[PDB]
């Protein structure tokens, strides 16, 4: 349950002009970096007070990487818009997800580098971090240009080690923000669905992290089994259940969270 | 008139490297500007300095979006631009697995003998380019033992020097690979 996920998007405008590039980084559930090509002077901005403590050469090297990948993605938009013979009419999108999921030990479990063009998957790095999967022939041209560069070797070195090492370093540095929990502030709503039907919603608001278990229980057993950003780094998740109207005293919402020692039982008290 | 563009130290540029496009003219322009045509066009304004007049345009660090065809213009004060200088095709290299550069029958040869240079790579390059004795452009055969090869029979133009060659794809004639191991041909 530990991951470093980078999300990149480059949108090509119709005609001449730099396609706008943007890239955000998440450690677990927290956004901690961001870059935007279309600033007055584009550079890499922090998004949490626990990466501000990183040295000058860190932010310098990071920013340089972001710039080179920006130009690389704009050129990629040009070439791709040349691979399907699509004239100046049309604004396009290019997305890339690059991240790593840590294992039960201090070493890598999963490496991701996916690339999608205008919504559909385009080219992806295979799970062995050595092969590729292409969606069509154009992505096979891309596959040749990428194998000629040996980006799978570079990337395998990045995911295996650098992504993991710096994941551990970010966890350690930010254990006062990431490895701490926030208990949820609760409330239960009730809406009439039909004549004999009524819907109950178990709202858990302002909590960290995202891992939360919401179960509706009728007397006894389970009945059931999304989240949205609260805006301050926390989340909101509601658990719905459809019950016969006039029988809501029996159904109770049990709730398990990291910040909760004992689970919470929550019945509809309309007061 | 036209201005005079040239490259320093050369028209080929490795990645993460900066070049100096020098645009000089005898007209004593007080302003200069440098335009790149290619995948992404651009213009750069700069001041003219009277050493002859000239401007030194610092390009870099070179990346795929900075290669292309370059033309500089001179002006006074507002702008009153000149006719374009001769174009100059700045090329980005150092992006892919370097090809191999073999020689036939060998690197050094007897005086009165011809040499053929062969560029071969497991990477599936469309074209191969050859310098310098930076002009030679040939295409690549599809497969032998999984490798892609181009052959430059130098025939009557073999005088020796250091030779490097690059691989390139057809959609990007300005994006070239790493330099091959530079091979010195001597006419022993």
């Amino acid at each position: 349950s530990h991951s470093m996920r980078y999300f990149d998007t480059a949108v090509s405008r119709p005609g001449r002009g730099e396609p706008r590039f943007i890239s955000v980084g998440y450690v677990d559930d927290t956004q901690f970096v961001r870059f935007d090509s279309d600033a007055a002077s584009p550079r890499g901005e922090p998004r949490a007070p626990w990466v501000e403590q990183e040295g000058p050469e860190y932010w310098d090297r990071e920013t340089q990487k972001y710039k080179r990948q920006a130009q690389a993605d704009r050129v990629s938009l040009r070439n791709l818009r040349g691979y399907y013979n699509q004239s100046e009419d049309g604004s396009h999108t290019l997305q890339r997800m690059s991240g790593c999921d840590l294992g039960p030990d201090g070493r890598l479990l999963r490496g991701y580098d996916q690339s999608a063009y205008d919504g559909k998957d385009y080219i992806a790095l295979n799970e062995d971090l050595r092969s590729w999967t292409a969606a069509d022939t154009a992505a096979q041209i891309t596959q040749r240009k990428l194998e000629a560069a040996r980006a799978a070797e570079q990337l395998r070195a990045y995911l295996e080690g650098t992504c993991v090492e710096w994941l551990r370093r970010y966890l350690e540095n930010g254990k006062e923000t990431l490895q701490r929990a926030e208990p949820p502030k609760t409330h239960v709503t009730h809406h009439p669905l039909s004549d004999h039907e009524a819907t109950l919603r178990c709202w858990a608001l302002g909590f960290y992290p995202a891992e939360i278990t919401l179960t509706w229980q009728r007397d006894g057993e389970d009945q059931t089994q999304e989240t949205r950003p609260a805006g301050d780094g926390t989340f909101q998740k509601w658990a719905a259940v459809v019950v016969p109207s006039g029988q809501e005293q029996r159904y109770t919402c049990h709730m398990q969270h990291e910040g909760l020692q004992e689970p919470l039982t929550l019945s509809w008290e309309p007061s | 008139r036209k201005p005079s563009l040239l490259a320093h130290p050369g028209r080929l540029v490795k990645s993460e490297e900066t070049v100096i496009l020098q645009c000089w003219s005898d007209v004593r322009f007080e302003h200069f500007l440098l335009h790149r045509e290619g995948k992404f066009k651009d213009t750069l304004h700069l001041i003219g300095e009277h050493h002859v007049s000239k401007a030194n345009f610092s390009i870099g660090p070179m990346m795929q979006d900075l290669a292309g065809t370059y033309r500089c213009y001179g002006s006074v004060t507002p702008y009153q631009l000149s006719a374009p200088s001769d174009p100059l095709d700045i090329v980005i290299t150092g992006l892919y697995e370097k090809p191999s550069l073999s020689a036939q029958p060998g690197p050094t040869v007897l005086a009165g003998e011809s040499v053929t240079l062969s560029c071969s790579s497991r990477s599936s390059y469309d074209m191969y380019h050859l310098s310098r004795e930076h002009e030679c452009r040939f295409s690549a055969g599809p497969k032998v033992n999984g490798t892609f090869q181009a052959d430059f029979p130098l025939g009557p133009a073999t005088h020796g020097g250091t030779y490097r060659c690059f691989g390139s794809f057809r959609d990007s004639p300005y994006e070239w690979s790493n330099s091959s191991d530079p091979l010195l041909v001597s006419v022993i």
């Binding site: 990948q69 385009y122 560069a149 980006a151 | -």
Partner: peptide
């Protein structure tokens, strides 16, 4: 940190 700078696709 961020992925290394790679070539254009």
């Amino acid at each position: 940190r961020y992925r290394p700078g790679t070539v254009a696709l």
